[PDB]
Amino acid sequence: HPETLVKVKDAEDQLGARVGYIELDLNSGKILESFRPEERFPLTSTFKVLLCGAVLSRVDAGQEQLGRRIHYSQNDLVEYSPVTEKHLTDGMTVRELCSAAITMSDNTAANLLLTTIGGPKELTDFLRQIGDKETRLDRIEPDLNEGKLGDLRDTTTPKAIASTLRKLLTGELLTLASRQQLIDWMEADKVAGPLLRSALPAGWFIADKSGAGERGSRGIIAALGPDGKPSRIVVIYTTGSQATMDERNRQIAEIGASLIKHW
Ligand SMILES: [Cl-]
Ligand SMILES: [Cl-]
Ligand SMILES: [Cl-]
Ligand SMILES: [Cl-]
Ligand SMILES: [Mg+2]
Ligand SMILES: [Mg+2]
Ligand SMILES: [Mg+2]
């Protein structure tokens, strides 16, 4: 809706940074609204959904088991790993790792899952195979969060990842069991949800993944809608701002508030 565009522009002005935005109709994939939809932005932790989609695709193909236990070491632990920090001695199952990676944004969990699939290049190959010609993962956590000026590594476009999310959550790319598991992880309660959850009306559905990185990078991908069912995909990205984190979050949240008000 045009009012949302005005709020996207106001966010650019307040943040001193580009903001990319797309809304899709979930059933049809029709683009309902867009701003800088084909410009590149860092993925940051939004990639963790794509990662777990690649894992679930392997499960469906009999190449991975959700109950397989992954053993790792102290040196595998990277910053912002609140779940994996608690399982050095006992390990974690693949299922537990995806839950941590999505719901808790656990960085080491994502790195371990990347090992299970064979690395960033294998994620990128999975994306290409399902028809995403843009998204790329090149590095692991935390370096993928760098957000360097002029760097194409670890980026997507709003349009590309919106379409990819729709492929993962709807249709037949994943089995029903895997689709539902991915949605369940994305819908699970989180510690704080400033970007969209804070705007979402009661009774509405949201399955989301946020991301935050260096150099102003921030984003969210979501499927949301009224009456306990999703009906739209929304993607919002920004990078480059040196405003405070609170200001970044507030500006993105106001985009979401507009989307809901003008739904
Ligand atoms: Cl535009
Ligand atoms: Cl564009
Ligand atoms: Cl492995
Ligand atoms: Cl959030
Ligand atoms: Mg060991
Ligand atoms: Mg649930
Ligand atoms: Mg809840």
Residue numbers in the entry: 26 to 238, 240 to 252, 254 to 290
What does the literature reporting this entry say, word for word?
The system of five interrelated, functional β-lactamases stems from the recombination of two homologs, the TEM-1 penicillinase and the PSE-4 carbenicillinase.
The Ω-loop active-site wall contains the conserved Glu166, proposed to serve as a general base in the catalytic acylation and deacylation steps. Their active-site cavity volume (cTEM-19m: 741 Å3; cTEM-17m: 746 Å3) is nearly twice larger than the cavity of native TEM-1 (384 Å3), PSE-4 (427 Å3) and cTEM-2m (393 Å3). This opens and increases the active-site volume relative to the t80° conformation observed in all other native and mutant apoenzyme structures of TEM-1 and PSE-4. The inclusion of 17 substitutions left cTEM-17m essentially unaltered relative to TEM-1, but inclusion of the substitutions Met68Leu/Met69Thr in cTEM-2m and cTEM-19m dropped kcat 1 to 3 orders of magnitude, to levels similar to PSE-4. The Y105 wall displayed slow dynamics in the three chimeras, with a 4-fold difference in kex for cTEM-17m (300 ± 90 s−1) and cTEM-19m (1,220 ± 230 s−1).
